[PDB]
Task: structure prediction
Amino acid sequence: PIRLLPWLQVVKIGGRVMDRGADAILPLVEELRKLLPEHRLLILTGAGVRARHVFSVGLDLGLPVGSLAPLAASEAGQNGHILAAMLASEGVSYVEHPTVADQLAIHLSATRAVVGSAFPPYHHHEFPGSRIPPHRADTGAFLLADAFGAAGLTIVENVDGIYTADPNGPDRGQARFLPETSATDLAKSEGPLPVDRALLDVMATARHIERVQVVNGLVPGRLTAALRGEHVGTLIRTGVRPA
Amino acid sequence: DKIIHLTDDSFDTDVLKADGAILVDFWAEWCGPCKMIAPILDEIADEYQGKLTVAKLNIDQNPGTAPKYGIRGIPTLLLFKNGEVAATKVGALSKGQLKEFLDANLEEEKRKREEELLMQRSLTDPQLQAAAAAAADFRILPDATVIKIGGQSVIDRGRAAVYPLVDEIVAARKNHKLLIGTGAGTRARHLYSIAAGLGLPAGVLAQLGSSVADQNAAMLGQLLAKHGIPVVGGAGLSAVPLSLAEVNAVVFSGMPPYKLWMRPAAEGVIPPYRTDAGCFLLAEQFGCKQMIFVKDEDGLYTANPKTSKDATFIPRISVDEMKAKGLHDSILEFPVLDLLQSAQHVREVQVVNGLVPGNLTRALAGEHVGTIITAS
Ligand SMILES: Nc1ncnc2c1ncn2[C@@H]1O[C@H](COP(=O)(O)OP(=O)(O)OP(=O)(O)O)[C@@H](O)[C@H]1O
Ligand SMILES: Nc1ncnc2c1ncn2[C@@H]1O[C@H](COP(=O)(O)OP(=O)(O)OP(=O)(O)O)[C@@H](O)[C@H]1O
Ligand SMILES: [Mg+2]
Result:
């Protein structure tokens, strides 16, 4: 399988990072600004806390998973409009799912970076089993990053990376940092992760992307570093054998 | 212990001016049924840490408070919510009967803490995932049924296959509410072969296949237009409610909207989720009555009957029984059976021979003809 846009750098901004407002966003916008003359970025944005509120209302109404996914996905679309507005003076705009899928090469020939929703357009066709949509922001970013045969995917979280337990949870003392992991190893272990369990499932079927680094967007320089292959967070091996 | 020993004076600041639910025991050392509930009561104090606060008021030491609330029995448990008596429980209770009472009153409080958990904890967390599964199940179109009109199996054949099925559809429509989905076929097989030839990913192939399924929906929907049955899409299905209500049927394109975000297969660039998956998940999402796959064979056989001199027909089979038989080629895409097991609304599918007259009408009326693939 051919790499469609091999020069592409896919960067996913966590929804919970957006939720932090001006304190997290303003520095990140400067980091992103300084990155434009270095990389040809596709900046995909997560949903965060509003998706939870749409879930709490949606589930209280008894709505199925396929109803909740578009709703959740809409929130990611809004953080995208926010981020793109901050980068508008740099010629950056939020672009919709049909435009990402078909006209990305033109949009990236026109500008240095474009913002899009991280979430995939599964809509009604989301998978059952769980009342919570499985194919979320991290999953949607990876499926798209691997589809385009891009140079890489970088997840921008509000934590240093993946830990043995939630670092902001009750057992935070018994949580230790993981500099490296396998998608297989994380899938086997049960409990919470800063990434979707669906992302690890889709990484098993990956074609091009070998590692996905999870980095702290609240620390300026991390994203810049990760994009240069510098190990500044958790590297997740996908299980795509090199040459 | 977490149990607070109250006094006549302390009752204003410890009970009335205290936030959150409080359970107060109006007890006395002489009272037999008190001596019985007392160990049960300091036990629930720990079992209900942060949920409820237990309080005790010995009447013999504090005799003022009891007559204020009309306490004419011992023990009497009063559940205080913001300085007002919410619920009362006079007499002795068992361990289980006390929880039964507390829970039936603290439902709104439990709902509020579960909501808080759904907004603080990660979506990957198992406790959050388990609490969500416990939510209510709503069926959007429950009296509706989803039908797949095969691309290669029927639409690619043309008039001889399509025209009779249209007649069955226009008629059945009077009694049942139908969501008619289309397949793709040989034009999609050709695109796949060309695209694969170039090494294009499944995401790209998925978009190609989608168009053939759109053409078939446009062709099928044209023969039904005189009957008022419309063709739907737009990735939102905004037109489906009105059409199902008024004309009782719609024609949609069976392809999932995944496009470039299509999950690839284990190996190869053929999209694993095609029109069988697109149709099934639309039946699963709306919470439809049944899911019927209209094909060119009586149902499932031991092997492909087009490439088998003698194959045994299977009228009823489960997905586990199918996987265990190891099907070389199935009547339906392998991932549809994996989705059928995970399904919440459509816990079985039916395959019928649309080339045989009446098969659709008979399957629609509920009568089992062809193969029924059950989830468990
Ligand atoms: N094993 C873990 N390692 C690291 N963080 C964890 C782990 N388990 C849970 N967490 C929690 O996950 C949080 C990240 O939240 P989450 O992944 O829901 O947000 P997001 O990625 O910004 O959102 P979105 O899915 O909308 O893009 C961290 O702040 C941390 O509290
Ligand atoms: N064991 C089997 N039993 C019955 N039919 C089988 C079996 N193995 C293979 N088949 C064949 O599998 C085919 C499944 O249907 P078909 O290929 O027409 O898909 P379709 O509904 O047109 O979908 P698409 O849009 O992907 O083309 C049938 O033509 C059938 O003859
Ligand atoms: Mg995350």
User: Anything to note?
Assistant: The longest helix of chain A spans residues 65-86. DSSP finds nine helices and seven strands in chain A. Residues B 150-153, 183-185, 188, 274-275, 295-297, 300-301, 303-306, 329-331 surround adenosine-5'-triphosphate (ligand 2) (CB under 6 Å).
